[PDB]
Protein backbone atom coordinates (compact mmCIF):
# COMPACT_ATOMS: atom_id res chain seq x y z
CA UNK A 1 0.00 0.00 0.00
CA UNK A 2 1.54 3.24 -1.16
CA UNK A 3 0.38 6.85 -0.74
CA UNK A 4 2.39 10.10 -0.86
CA UNK A 5 3.78 10.77 2.64
CA UNK A 6 1.58 13.79 3.50
CA UNK A 7 1.38 14.88 7.13
CA UNK A 8 -0.90 17.86 6.57
CA UNK A 9 -4.49 17.48 7.69
CA UNK A 10 -7.39 18.62 5.46
CA UNK A 11 -9.15 21.76 6.83
CA UNK A 12 -12.68 20.40 6.86
CA UNK A 13 -13.27 22.08 10.20
CA UNK A 14 -12.79 25.40 8.42
CA UNK A 15 -15.63 24.47 6.08
CA UNK A 16 -18.14 22.80 8.37
CA UNK A 17 -17.48 24.89 11.54
CA UNK A 18 -16.94 28.17 9.56
CA UNK A 19 -18.08 31.35 11.23
CA UNK A 20 -20.30 32.15 8.25
CA UNK A 21 -21.57 30.46 5.12
CA UNK A 22 -22.06 32.36 1.88
CA UNK A 23 -25.37 33.10 0.25
CA UNK A 24 -26.58 30.51 -2.23
CA UNK A 25 -26.37 33.00 -5.10
CA UNK A 26 -22.67 33.53 -4.37
CA UNK A 27 -21.55 30.24 -2.91
CA UNK A 28 -17.95 29.75 -1.82
CA UNK A 29 -15.65 27.24 -3.49
CA UNK A 30 -12.78 26.12 -1.30
CA UNK A 31 -9.96 24.01 -2.68
CA UNK A 32 -8.74 21.09 -0.61
CA UNK A 33 -5.31 19.75 -1.56
CA UNK A 34 -1.99 18.31 -0.36
CA UNK A 35 -3.51 16.89 2.85
CA UNK A 36 -4.89 13.87 4.67
CA UNK A 37 -8.65 13.62 4.50
CA UNK A 38 -10.29 11.74 7.32
CA UNK A 39 -13.87 11.28 6.22
CA UNK A 40 -14.88 9.09 9.12
CA UNK A 41 -15.29 12.22 11.17
CA UNK A 42 -17.79 13.76 8.80
CA UNK A 43 -19.61 10.50 8.21
CA UNK A 44 -19.84 9.42 11.84
CA UNK A 45 -20.85 12.88 13.00
CA UNK A 46 -24.51 12.77 14.01
CA UNK A 47 -24.92 16.53 13.68
CA UNK A 48 -25.76 16.24 9.99
CA UNK A 49 -29.36 16.07 8.82
CA UNK A 50 -28.25 14.45 5.60
CA UNK A 51 -25.15 12.89 4.10
CA UNK A 52 -26.06 11.73 0.63
CA UNK A 53 -23.38 10.42 -1.74
CA UNK A 54 -23.98 10.26 -5.46
CA UNK A 55 -20.41 9.36 -6.35
CA UNK A 56 -19.02 6.72 -4.02
CA UNK A 57 -20.05 5.03 -0.80
CA UNK A 58 -19.16 7.32 2.17
CA UNK A 59 -17.24 4.61 4.00
CA UNK A 60 -14.89 3.98 1.06
CA UNK A 61 -13.68 7.58 1.09
CA UNK A 62 -10.84 6.69 3.42
CA UNK A 63 -9.30 4.02 1.14
CA UNK A 64 -9.94 5.93 -2.06
CA UNK A 65 -8.20 9.24 -2.84
CA UNK A 66 -8.45 12.18 -5.17
CA UNK A 67 -6.65 14.58 -7.49
CA UNK A 68 -8.59 17.31 -5.75
CA UNK A 69 -11.62 17.99 -3.59
CA UNK A 70 -13.73 21.12 -3.70
CA UNK A 71 -16.06 22.23 -0.96
CA UNK A 72 -18.98 24.32 -2.10
CA UNK A 73 -20.29 26.14 0.98
CA UNK A 74 -23.57 28.05 1.23
CA UNK A 75 -26.89 28.63 3.05
CA UNK A 76 -30.23 27.40 1.73
CA UNK A 77 -33.78 26.98 2.99
CA UNK A 78 -34.58 23.51 4.40
CA UNK A 79 -37.08 22.66 1.65
CA UNK A 80 -34.37 23.41 -0.92
CA UNK A 81 -32.14 20.56 0.29
CA UNK A 82 -33.84 18.30 -2.25
CA UNK A 83 -32.65 20.51 -5.11
CA UNK A 84 -28.99 19.91 -4.50
CA UNK A 85 -28.56 16.77 -6.50
CA UNK A 86 -27.76 15.64 -10.06
CA UNK A 87 -30.89 15.52 -12.21
CA UNK A 88 -32.80 18.08 -10.12
CA UNK A 89 -34.41 21.37 -11.12
CA UNK A 90 -35.85 24.28 -9.14
CA UNK A 91 -35.13 27.86 -8.18
CA UNK A 92 -31.76 26.99 -6.70
CA UNK A 93 -30.86 24.16 -9.02
CA UNK A 94 -31.54 26.41 -12.00
CA UNK A 95 -30.50 29.93 -10.91
CA UNK A 96 -28.03 29.61 -8.02
CA UNK A 97 -26.31 26.28 -7.72
CA UNK A 98 -26.27 23.78 -10.54
CA UNK A 99 -24.64 20.37 -10.26
CA UNK A 100 -23.55 18.17 -13.18
CA UNK A 101 -25.98 15.33 -13.73
CA UNK A 102 -22.94 13.07 -13.56
CA UNK A 103 -21.81 14.68 -10.30
CA UNK A 104 -19.36 12.67 -8.26
CA UNK A 105 -19.33 13.34 -4.56
CA UNK A 106 -21.43 13.90 -1.42
CA UNK A 107 -23.96 16.50 -0.27
CA UNK A 108 -23.86 17.19 3.45
CA UNK A 109 -26.31 19.48 5.22
CA UNK A 110 -27.59 20.41 8.66
CA UNK A 111 -30.02 22.77 10.35
CA UNK A 112 -28.72 26.17 11.43
CA UNK A 113 -31.96 27.28 13.10
CA UNK A 114 -30.06 27.59 16.37
CA UNK A 115 -27.12 29.38 14.75
CA UNK A 116 -27.99 31.68 11.85
CA UNK A 117 -31.68 32.38 12.48
CA UNK A 118 -32.58 35.72 14.21
CA UNK A 119 -35.25 37.75 11.08
CA UNK A 120 -31.87 37.01 9.44
CA UNK A 121 -32.05 38.38 5.90
CA UNK A 122 -28.33 38.20 5.12
CA UNK A 123 -28.78 35.28 2.75
CA UNK A 124 -29.74 35.95 -0.84
CA UNK A 125 -30.94 33.69 -3.63
CA UNK A 126 -31.68 34.44 -7.25
CA UNK A 127 -35.36 34.96 -7.86
CA UNK A 128 -35.12 36.16 -11.45
CA UNK A 129 -32.78 35.23 -14.29
CA UNK A 130 -33.09 34.87 -18.08
CA UNK A 131 -31.73 31.32 -18.36
CA UNK A 132 -30.46 28.41 -16.30
CA UNK A 133 -26.92 28.09 -14.93
CA UNK A 134 -24.15 25.87 -16.15
CA UNK A 135 -22.71 23.38 -13.61
CA UNK A 136 -20.65 25.12 -10.92
CA UNK A 137 -21.40 28.57 -12.33
CA UNK A 138 -21.24 31.55 -9.96
CA UNK A 139 -23.55 34.33 -11.27
CA UNK A 140 -36.46 48.46 -17.13
CA UNK A 141 -33.50 50.59 -18.17
CA UNK A 142 -32.13 51.19 -14.68
CA UNK A 143 -35.61 51.74 -13.27
CA UNK A 144 -37.07 48.93 -11.21
CA UNK A 145 -40.85 48.55 -11.07
CA UNK A 146 -43.66 46.44 -12.52
CA UNK A 147 -42.16 43.66 -14.65
CA UNK A 148 -38.69 45.21 -13.86
CA UNK A 149 -37.59 43.18 -10.89
CA UNK A 150 -34.47 43.17 -8.77
CA UNK A 151 -32.90 39.69 -9.33
CA UNK A 152 -32.03 38.82 -5.70
CA UNK A 153 -34.31 37.92 -2.81
CA UNK A 154 -33.47 37.38 0.85
CA UNK A 155 -34.59 34.56 3.11
CA UNK A 156 -36.46 35.62 6.24
CA UNK A 157 -34.84 33.09 8.54
CA UNK A 158 -36.33 33.06 12.03
CA UNK A 159 -35.99 30.62 15.00
CA UNK A 160 -39.76 30.22 14.85
CA UNK A 161 -39.77 28.82 11.24
CA UNK A 162 -38.65 22.93 9.52
CA UNK A 163 -38.81 23.56 5.71
CA UNK A 164 -38.39 27.28 6.37
CA UNK A 165 -35.43 26.90 8.71
CA UNK A 166 -31.96 27.76 7.36
CA UNK A 167 -29.65 24.92 6.47
CA UNK A 168 -25.93 24.94 5.99
CA UNK A 169 -24.88 22.83 3.07
CA UNK A 170 -21.47 21.69 1.96
CA UNK A 171 -21.06 19.87 -1.29
CA UNK A 172 -17.90 17.88 -1.71
CA UNK A 173 -16.97 17.56 -5.35
CA UNK A 174 -14.37 14.89 -5.96
CA UNK A 175 -12.10 14.69 -8.95
CA UNK A 176 -11.06 11.06 -9.07
CA UNK A 177 -9.43 10.91 -12.49
CA UNK A 178 -6.35 8.70 -12.64
CA UNK A 179 -3.83 11.47 -12.14
CA UNK A 180 -1.55 12.43 -9.19
CA UNK A 181 -3.52 12.38 -5.95
CA UNK A 182 -3.21 15.19 -3.45
CA UNK A 183 -6.07 14.47 -1.02
CA UNK A 184 -5.72 10.95 0.49
CA UNK A 185 -7.22 9.18 3.46
CA UNK A 186 -5.59 8.29 6.80
CA UNK A 187 -3.82 5.23 5.52
CA UNK A 188 -0.41 4.08 6.59
CA UNK A 189 1.85 3.20 3.71
CA UNK A 190 4.21 0.25 3.72
CA UNK A 191 7.39 -0.67 1.88
CA UNK A 192 7.37 -1.69 -1.75
CA UNK A 193 8.53 -5.16 -2.67
CA UNK A 194 9.72 -5.85 -6.20
CA UNK A 195 9.82 -8.96 -8.41
CA UNK A 196 7.23 -10.83 -6.37
CA UNK A 197 3.44 -11.34 -6.68
CA UNK A 198 1.76 -8.77 -4.46
CA UNK A 199 -1.64 -7.25 -3.78
CA UNK A 200 -1.03 -3.58 -4.47
CA UNK A 201 -2.75 -0.26 -3.79
CA UNK A 202 -1.39 2.90 -5.41
CA UNK A 203 -3.35 6.00 -4.43
CA UNK A 204 -6.56 3.96 -4.23
CA UNK A 205 -5.82 1.97 -7.41
CA UNK A 206 -5.75 -1.71 -6.65
CA UNK A 207 -4.89 -4.97 -8.35
CA UNK A 208 -2.63 -8.00 -8.15
CA UNK A 209 0.64 -8.36 -9.99
CA UNK A 210 4.40 -8.27 -9.99
CA UNK A 211 6.04 -4.86 -9.66
CA UNK A 212 9.28 -4.48 -11.62
CA UNK A 213 11.72 -1.77 -12.67
CA UNK A 214 10.88 -0.13 -15.99
CA UNK A 215 12.20 2.29 -18.56
CA UNK A 216 8.87 3.91 -19.40
CA UNK A 217 9.18 7.63 -19.82
CA UNK A 218 6.20 8.94 -17.90
CA UNK A 219 5.69 12.66 -18.28
CA UNK A 220 5.79 14.85 -15.10
CA UNK A 221 1.98 14.95 -15.02
CA UNK A 222 1.40 11.25 -15.74
CA UNK A 223 0.78 9.08 -12.71
CA UNK A 224 -0.55 5.96 -14.40
CA UNK A 225 -0.09 4.20 -17.73
CA UNK A 226 -2.61 1.93 -19.45
CA UNK A 227 -2.88 -1.17 -21.61
CA UNK A 228 -5.19 -1.83 -24.58
CA UNK A 229 -7.81 -3.21 -22.19
CA UNK A 230 -7.58 0.08 -20.23
CA UNK A 231 -6.06 -1.85 -17.35
CA UNK A 232 -3.06 -0.46 -15.54
Amino acid sequence: VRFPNITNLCPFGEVFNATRFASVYAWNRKRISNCVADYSVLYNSASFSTFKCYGVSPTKLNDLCFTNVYADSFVIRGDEVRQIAPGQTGKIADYNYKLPDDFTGCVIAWNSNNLDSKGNYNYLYRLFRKSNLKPFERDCNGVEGFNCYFPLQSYGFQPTNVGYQPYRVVVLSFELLHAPATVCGPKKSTNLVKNKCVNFNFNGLTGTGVLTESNKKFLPFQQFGRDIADTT
Partner: antibody
Amino acid sequence: VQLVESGGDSVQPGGSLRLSCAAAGFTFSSYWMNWVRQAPGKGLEWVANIKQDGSEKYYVDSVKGRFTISRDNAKNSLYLQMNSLRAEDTAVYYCALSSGYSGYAGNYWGQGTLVTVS
Amino acid sequence: AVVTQEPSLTVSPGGTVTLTCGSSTGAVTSGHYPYWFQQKPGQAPRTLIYDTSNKHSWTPARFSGSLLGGKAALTLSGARPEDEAEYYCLLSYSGARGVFGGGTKLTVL
Protein backbone atom coordinates in the same frame (compact mmCIF):
# COMPACT_ATOMS: atom_id res chain seq x y z
CA VAL B 1 -31.85 56.83 -11.66
CA GLN B 2 -32.05 60.49 -10.78
CA LEU B 3 -34.87 62.99 -10.65
CA VAL B 4 -33.87 66.60 -10.38
CA GLU B 5 -36.62 69.03 -9.54
CA SER B 6 -36.38 72.79 -9.24
CA GLY B 7 -38.26 76.07 -9.60
CA GLY B 8 -39.21 76.47 -5.94
CA ASP B 9 -38.71 80.01 -4.65
CA SER B 10 -40.27 82.69 -2.43
CA VAL B 11 -43.31 83.99 -4.28
CA GLN B 12 -46.38 86.12 -3.61
CA PRO B 13 -49.95 84.70 -3.26
CA GLY B 14 -52.31 85.18 -6.16
CA GLY B 15 -49.45 84.74 -8.62
CA SER B 16 -48.09 81.64 -10.31
CA LEU B 17 -45.02 79.45 -10.33
CA ARG B 18 -43.64 76.95 -12.82
CA LEU B 19 -41.82 73.96 -11.35
CA SER B 20 -39.85 71.46 -13.40
CA CYS B 21 -38.17 68.02 -13.24
CA ALA B 22 -35.36 66.64 -15.35
CA ALA B 23 -34.79 62.93 -15.81
CA ALA B 24 -31.30 61.47 -15.81
CA GLY B 25 -29.87 57.96 -16.13
CA PHE B 26 -33.08 56.50 -17.57
CA THR B 27 -35.61 56.88 -20.38
CA PHE B 28 -38.13 59.62 -19.71
CA SER B 29 -40.82 58.49 -22.15
CA SER B 30 -41.43 55.04 -20.72
CA TYR B 31 -42.66 56.05 -17.29
CA TRP B 32 -45.32 58.20 -15.64
CA MET B 33 -44.19 61.42 -13.96
CA ASN B 34 -45.65 62.31 -10.54
CA TRP B 35 -45.80 65.38 -8.33
CA VAL B 36 -46.30 65.23 -4.56
CA ARG B 37 -46.13 68.11 -2.11
CA GLN B 38 -45.43 68.28 1.59
CA ALA B 39 -46.17 71.21 3.86
CA PRO B 40 -43.62 71.41 6.71
CA GLY B 41 -44.89 69.53 9.75
CA LYS B 42 -47.51 67.75 7.60
CA GLY B 43 -47.84 64.48 5.70
CA LEU B 44 -47.72 63.98 1.94
CA GLU B 45 -50.31 65.31 -0.48
CA TRP B 46 -50.77 63.80 -3.90
CA VAL B 47 -50.83 66.63 -6.40
CA ALA B 48 -50.65 65.64 -10.00
CA ASN B 49 -49.44 63.19 -12.59
CA ILE B 50 -49.04 62.70 -16.31
CA LYS B 51 -49.15 59.69 -18.58
CA GLN B 52 -46.03 58.43 -20.31
CA ASP B 53 -46.86 60.03 -23.67
CA GLY B 54 -48.58 63.15 -22.28
CA SER B 55 -52.00 62.12 -23.64
CA GLU B 56 -53.58 62.12 -20.18
CA LYS B 57 -53.14 64.25 -17.07
CA TYR B 58 -54.32 63.70 -13.51
CA TYR B 59 -54.91 66.05 -10.61
CA VAL B 60 -56.10 65.91 -7.05
CA ASP B 61 -59.41 67.75 -7.06
CA SER B 62 -57.98 70.49 -4.78
CA VAL B 63 -55.63 71.73 -7.54
CA LYS B 64 -57.91 71.01 -10.46
CA GLY B 65 -58.18 73.93 -12.86
CA ARG B 66 -55.15 75.59 -11.26
CA PHE B 67 -52.37 73.14 -12.05
CA THR B 68 -51.21 72.23 -15.57
CA ILE B 69 -48.65 69.63 -16.67
CA SER B 70 -46.80 69.64 -19.95
CA ARG B 71 -43.64 67.90 -21.07
CA ASP B 72 -40.87 67.71 -23.62
CA ASN B 73 -39.78 64.18 -24.41
CA ALA B 74 -36.77 65.46 -26.32
CA LYS B 75 -35.42 67.14 -23.18
CA ASN B 76 -36.35 64.28 -20.88
CA SER B 77 -38.26 66.67 -18.64
CA LEU B 78 -41.69 67.82 -17.47
CA TYR B 79 -43.18 71.04 -16.18
CA LEU B 80 -45.84 71.72 -13.56
CA GLN B 81 -47.36 75.16 -13.63
CA MET B 82 -49.55 76.27 -10.78
CA ASN B 83 -51.80 79.30 -11.11
CA SER B 84 -53.66 81.24 -8.41
CA LEU B 85 -51.07 80.01 -5.95
CA ARG B 86 -52.34 80.23 -2.37
CA ALA B 87 -50.51 81.65 0.67
CA GLU B 88 -51.43 78.44 2.45
CA ASP B 89 -49.55 76.39 -0.17
CA THR B 90 -46.12 76.32 1.42
CA ALA B 91 -44.64 72.94 0.70
CA VAL B 92 -41.80 71.00 -0.78
CA TYR B 93 -42.67 69.69 -4.21
CA TYR B 94 -41.16 66.39 -5.17
CA CYS B 95 -40.68 64.74 -8.56
CA ALA B 96 -41.28 61.02 -8.54
CA LEU B 97 -40.92 58.35 -11.22
CA SER B 98 -43.74 55.87 -11.55
CA SER B 99 -42.70 52.54 -13.01
CA GLY B 100 -45.42 50.52 -11.34
CA TYR B 101 -48.43 48.76 -12.85
CA SER B 102 -50.84 51.69 -13.16
CA GLY B 103 -48.39 54.60 -13.17
CA TYR B 104 -50.36 56.46 -10.45
CA ALA B 105 -47.60 56.55 -7.79
CA GLY B 106 -43.84 57.10 -7.93
CA ASN B 107 -41.08 54.66 -6.92
CA TYR B 108 -38.01 56.84 -7.41
CA TRP B 109 -37.94 60.19 -5.67
CA GLY B 110 -35.97 63.40 -6.13
CA GLN B 111 -34.80 65.74 -3.37
CA GLY B 112 -37.64 68.25 -3.53
CA THR B 113 -37.92 71.95 -4.32
CA LEU B 114 -39.33 74.32 -1.71
CA VAL B 115 -42.18 76.62 -2.57
CA THR B 116 -42.89 79.36 -0.06
CA VAL B 117 -45.76 81.73 -0.57
CA SER B 118 -45.81 85.09 1.30
CA ALA C 1 -60.75 60.92 -1.21
CA VAL C 2 -60.30 59.82 2.38
CA VAL C 3 -57.47 57.68 3.66
CA THR C 4 -56.70 57.10 7.32
CA GLN C 5 -53.77 55.76 9.33
CA GLU C 6 -52.85 55.00 12.94
CA PRO C 7 -51.14 58.30 14.07
CA SER C 8 -48.16 56.55 15.65
CA LEU C 9 -46.65 53.22 16.65
CA THR C 10 -43.93 52.44 19.17
CA VAL C 11 -41.84 49.29 18.99
CA SER C 12 -39.06 47.83 21.14
CA PRO C 13 -35.83 46.97 19.26
CA GLY C 14 -36.25 43.56 17.61
CA GLY C 15 -40.05 43.71 17.98
CA THR C 16 -42.58 43.53 15.19
CA VAL C 17 -44.59 46.41 13.77
CA THR C 18 -47.97 46.56 12.08
CA LEU C 19 -48.42 49.91 10.32
CA THR C 20 -51.92 50.21 8.86
CA CYS C 21 -53.77 52.20 6.15
CA GLY C 22 -57.18 52.21 4.53
CA SER C 23 -59.89 54.07 2.66
CA SER C 24 -63.16 55.34 4.09
CA THR C 25 -65.19 53.36 1.55
CA GLY C 26 -65.13 49.81 0.20
CA ALA C 27 -62.00 47.87 1.14
CA VAL C 28 -58.34 47.80 0.26
CA THR C 29 -57.45 45.13 -2.24
CA SER C 30 -54.76 44.69 -4.88
CA GLY C 31 -56.99 46.81 -7.15
CA HIS C 32 -55.86 49.89 -5.19
CA TYR C 33 -52.27 49.00 -6.03
CA PRO C 34 -51.20 50.36 -2.58
CA TYR C 35 -47.89 52.16 -2.03
CA TRP C 36 -45.90 52.79 1.15
CA PHE C 37 -43.21 55.43 1.63
CA GLN C 38 -40.59 56.06 4.30
CA GLN C 39 -39.42 59.53 5.22
CA LYS C 40 -36.57 60.30 7.56
CA PRO C 41 -35.98 63.91 8.73
CA GLY C 42 -34.32 65.98 6.00
CA GLN C 43 -35.01 63.31 3.36
CA ALA C 44 -37.40 62.88 0.46
CA PRO C 45 -40.01 60.09 0.85
CA ARG C 46 -38.68 56.77 -0.39
CA THR C 47 -41.03 54.14 -1.73
CA LEU C 48 -40.62 50.82 -0.02
CA ILE C 49 -43.69 48.96 -1.26
CA TYR C 50 -45.42 49.29 -4.60
CA ASP C 51 -48.37 47.66 -6.31
CA THR C 52 -49.60 46.08 -3.05
CA SER C 53 -46.69 43.88 -2.07
CA ASN C 54 -43.70 44.42 -4.33
CA LYS C 55 -40.60 45.40 -2.39
CA HIS C 56 -37.88 47.68 -3.77
CA SER C 57 -34.19 46.73 -3.85
CA TRP C 58 -33.31 49.57 -1.48
CA THR C 59 -35.83 48.39 1.10
CA PRO C 60 -34.57 46.19 3.98
CA ALA C 61 -36.19 42.77 3.76
CA ARG C 62 -37.31 43.20 7.34
CA PHE C 63 -40.21 45.19 5.82
CA SER C 64 -43.24 43.41 4.35
CA GLY C 65 -45.95 44.92 2.12
CA SER C 66 -48.81 42.74 3.34
CA LEU C 67 -52.55 43.36 3.35
CA LEU C 68 -54.83 42.91 6.36
CA GLY C 69 -58.63 42.81 6.78
CA GLY C 70 -59.48 45.13 3.88
CA LYS C 71 -56.55 47.38 4.78
CA ALA C 72 -53.02 48.03 3.54
CA ALA C 73 -50.14 47.45 5.91
CA LEU C 74 -46.42 47.74 6.21
CA THR C 75 -45.08 45.34 8.75
CA LEU C 76 -41.71 44.64 10.28
CA SER C 77 -40.22 41.31 11.39
CA GLY C 78 -37.92 43.13 13.82
CA ALA C 79 -37.53 46.91 14.00
CA ARG C 80 -34.22 48.70 14.44
CA PRO C 81 -33.33 52.33 15.49
CA GLU C 82 -32.46 52.96 11.84
CA ASP C 83 -36.17 52.58 11.04
CA GLU C 84 -37.33 55.66 12.92
CA ALA C 85 -39.29 57.49 10.25
CA GLU C 86 -42.69 58.73 9.28
CA TYR C 87 -44.48 56.35 6.98
CA TYR C 88 -47.08 57.24 4.44
CA CYS C 89 -49.59 55.19 2.47
CA LEU C 90 -51.09 55.95 -0.90
CA LEU C 91 -54.12 54.34 -2.56
CA SER C 92 -55.44 54.57 -6.16
CA TYR C 93 -59.16 54.90 -6.92
CA SER C 94 -61.24 55.46 -10.07
CA GLY C 95 -58.05 56.44 -11.85
CA ALA C 96 -54.59 57.85 -11.25
CA ARG C 97 -55.72 60.30 -8.57
CA GLY C 98 -54.09 58.82 -5.53
CA VAL C 99 -54.85 59.83 -1.96
CA PHE C 100 -52.36 59.83 0.90
CA GLY C 101 -53.16 58.87 4.46
CA GLY C 102 -52.41 61.14 7.41
CA GLY C 103 -49.08 59.44 8.06
CA THR C 104 -48.05 56.96 10.73
CA LYS C 105 -45.04 57.85 12.86
CA LEU C 106 -42.89 54.89 13.83
CA THR C 107 -40.40 55.17 16.67
CA VAL C 108 -38.14 52.68 18.41
CA LEU C 109 -38.15 52.26 22.23
